[PDB]
Amino acid sequence: YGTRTHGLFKKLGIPGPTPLPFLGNALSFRKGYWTFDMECYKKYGKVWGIYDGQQPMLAITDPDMIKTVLVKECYSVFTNRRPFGPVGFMKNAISIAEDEEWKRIRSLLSPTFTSGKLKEMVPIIAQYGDVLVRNLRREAETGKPVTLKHVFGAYSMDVITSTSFGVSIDSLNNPQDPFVENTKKLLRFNPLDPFVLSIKVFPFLTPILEALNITVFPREVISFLTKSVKQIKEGRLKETQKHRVDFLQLMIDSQNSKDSETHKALSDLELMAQSIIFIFAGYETTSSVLSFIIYELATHPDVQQKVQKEIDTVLPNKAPPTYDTVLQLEYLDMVVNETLRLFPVAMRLERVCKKDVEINGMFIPKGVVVMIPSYVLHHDPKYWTEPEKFLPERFSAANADNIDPYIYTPFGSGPRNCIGMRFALVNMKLALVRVLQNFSFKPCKETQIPLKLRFGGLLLTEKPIVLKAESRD
Ligand code: HEM
Ligand SMILES: C[C@]12CC[C@H](OS(=O)(=O)O)CC1=CC[C@@H]1[C@@H]2CC[C@]2(C)C(=O)CC[C@@H]12
Ligand SMILES: C[C@]12CC[C@H](OS(=O)(=O)O)CC1=CC[C@@H]1[C@@H]2CC[C@]2(C)C(=O)CC[C@@H]12
């Protein structure tokens, strides 16, 4: 079994590194997905193939092929992400459901993710900006370098947990709160657990374990959150009077009243899957991107200044940020967009080939995972002049046509792209405005001079990011 599918690419004429029995190329990943992909591209070129366990993955880099995979042949061939072992009911989570199941869950969640529903929700999020400034002021007034991830992670979990589960929390000033402890326990599951790496090697074990309700997610944590959420929904029915606008409230409203009577409404179970998956998807991505943004700003003090000026122009005298004012921070959007070009935390987009296909003159067999190396295409001199430089003007209104949405894909693209993109961008800007309104960041002795990535599911750093924050007056 261990060296079965390993002659697949060589029969297809596709270059790639030579796999090992059982593990495929998995070991060569431990240097970092961003590095491995880069190396393969310079060596094998336009297209290469690799093996993760027994799973063949065909990395492609032509935008025309990428566009075909992510948009046109999305519903028909390239609809699903890889499985990663025995889930349980989490099969209903939007990012794990497949095919039609997925197409319905996405359709049901789309109303809950409208921009107008996002604008309604911002004022509940603002309060967690109050807390970020507190947490940061306490660390900074000590004249002791700040660990970005300490406070931004606190902000990330604070927002995403609160709004997904309907309860306010403060993971830093109240970690005893069972929701903080339990959610942290949940967010410790990650695709690089040994149990997953072993299921990746022997995928045929999954059916059996799902026959035995042996799931890859924490059994007990999820039983807690589920009951804790149940009580919320019910203690929420009795208090008619109050109008909630968090993610929980919009998904309950969607349960009653069927718009688009094509689909049956969400069950209570499917609804838990969404709230849990929102956190997995929102927590660490946001925490990382905010950290990388502050870092870029610290090592580019003139950019930091332009951001601060625009903030002060659009929000005079530390005016509180709102949905409609965040929407005016044109230069801040460019800063964010440029930080995601250098630091696409996902690193890769992945899609499963449902059937034999030929796309843009290339045959792809059923069962292969088409992989788009977003990190590679983001740093490619072929599409980006001077690509390792932070230059937010790249994303100016004037260079809009110079930007291919199938090269730059920090939120993926197409029908299965990040459903929370707009939320993530608003939320990150609420944080950035509140922080930069009060503080400025500069390097310190500790700050790791050029930044160094580390192996992980997301883009992580070797050493944490330490900066000093100096109060503004
Ligand atoms: C900076 C923050 C974030 C980044 C960089 C990010 C990035 C991504 C990427 C690259 C994908 C894959 C898209 C594809 O394969 O084409 C994705 C999927 C997804 N994201 Fe995020 N994300 C962020 C925040 C969030 C937040 C806050 C939420 C929820 C509120 C969220 C919810 C989702 C969901 C549900 C999916 C799965 C979509 C599906 O399978 O239908 N993300 N995200
Ligand atoms: C996983 C392994 C051993 C490695 C074989 O790979 S192979 O190249 O020797 O065919 C495939 C394989 C198949 C079934 C697996 C076996 C390992 C022992 C297993 C898991 C049990 O207790 C019951 C099922 C057995
Ligand atoms: C894990 C599962 C079946 C699912 C049960 O969950 S439950 O909600 O039905 O109680 C818990 C559970 C308990 C004992 C577990 C069993 C799976 C099979 C196990 C692991 C063995 O070979 C010996 C111990 C057995």
- Considering every ligand atom, which ligand is closest to the CA of 54? 2
Which of helix, strand or coil describes residue 43?
A: helix
Which of helix, strand or coil describes residue 330?
A: helix
Q: Whose CA is nearest to atom 19 of ligand 1?
A: 418
The residue to which tokens 């003090």 are assigned:
301
Contacts with 289 (C-beta within 8 Å, 6 or more apart), sequence order: 336, 339, 340, 343, 345, 424, 428
Contacts with 139 (C-beta within 8 Å, 6 or more apart), sequence order: 146, 147, 150, 151, 469
Phi-psi label, residue 316: left if phi above 0, alpha if psi -120 to 50, beta otherwise = beta
What is the rounded CA–CA span in Å between residue 419 and residue 163? 15
Q: What is the resolution of this structure in A?
A: 2.6
Which of helix, strand or coil describes residue 58?
A: strand
Residue 190 CB–ligand 3 contact under 6 Å: no
Does residue 280 fall inside a structural domain?
yes
Does residue 282 fall inside a structural domain?
yes
The residue to which tokens 């309060």 are assigned:
127
**How far is Cα of residue 206 from the mean position of the Cα atoms in its chain?**
25
Nearest C-alpha neighbor of 354 from the set 362, 363, 344, 364 = 364
Does residue 1 fall inside a structural domain?
no
With contact defined as beta carbons under 8 Å apart, do 434 and 132 qualify? yes
What is the rounded CA–CA span in Å between residue 282 and residue 248? 15
What is the rounded CA–CA span in Å between residue 187 and residue 411? 21
Contacts with 32 (C-beta within 8 Å, 6 or more apart), sequence order: 453, 454, 455, 456
Does residue 38 fall inside a structural domain?
yes
Strands (E), 386-437: none
Residues with CB under 6 A from ligand 1: 94-95, 106, 160, 277-278, 281-282, 285-286, 289, 345-346, 349, 410-412, 416-420, 423-424
What is the rounded CA–CA span in Å between residue 237 and residue 82? 38
Does residue 67 fall inside a structural domain?
yes
DSSP state of 19: P
What's at 30, amino acid-wise?
A: R
Structure tokens at 205: 């074990």
In this structure, how many other beta carbons lie within 10 angstroms of the beta carbon of residue 179?
A: 20
DSSP state of 68: I
Q: Which CATH number characterizes residue 303's domain?
A: 1.10.630.10
418 in a known ligand binding site: yes
Q: Describe the crossing of helices 219-237 and 268-298 by its angle, rounded to 10 degrees.
A: 100
Domain ranges, residue 309 = 7-471
Cα(380) to centroid(ligand 3), Å? 50
Strands (E), 321-459: 349-352, 357-358, 363-364, 369-372, 439-442, 453-454
- Considering every ligand atom, which ligand is closest to the CA of 205? 2
Count structural domains, the chain: 1
How far are the Cα atoms of 133, 152, 315, 464 from residue 127, in angstroms, in the given order?
10, 15, 17, 27
**How far is Cα of residue 435 from the mean position of the Cα atoms in its chain?**
22
Q: Is the dihedral of CA 40, 44, 46, 50 positive or negative?
A: negative
In this structure, how many other beta carbons lie within 10 angstroms of the beta carbon of residue 132?
A: 23
Which of helix, strand or coil describes residue 467?
A: strand
DSSP state of 83: P
Q: Are strands 146-147 and 363-364 parallel, antiparallel or unpaired?
A: unpaired
Q: In sequence order, which ranges of 266-373 are alpha helices (DSSP H)? A: 268-298, 301-314, 323-326, 330-342
Q: In sequence order, which ranges of 299-382 are alpha helices (DSSP H)? A: 301-314, 323-326, 330-342, 374-378
In this structure, how many other beta carbons lie within 10 angstroms of the beta carbon of residue 281?
A: 19
The residue to which tokens 């240097």 are assigned:
31
**Nearest 10 degrees: Cα torsion 258, 259, 263, 268:** -40
Q: Which residues pair with 47 in a beta bridge?
A: 60
How far are the Cα atoms of 31, 62, 63, 94, 463 from residue 47, in angstroms, in the given order?
21, 8, 12, 30, 33
Q: What's the number of CA atoms in the CB half-sphere (13 Å) around residue 456?
A: 17
What's at 228, amino acid-wise?
A: S
Report the greatest alpha carbon distance in the chain: 67
Does residue 2 fall inside a structural domain?
no
Which of helix, strand or coil describes residue 384?
A: coil
**Given the CA of residue 4, which atom of ligand 2 is nearest to it?**
8
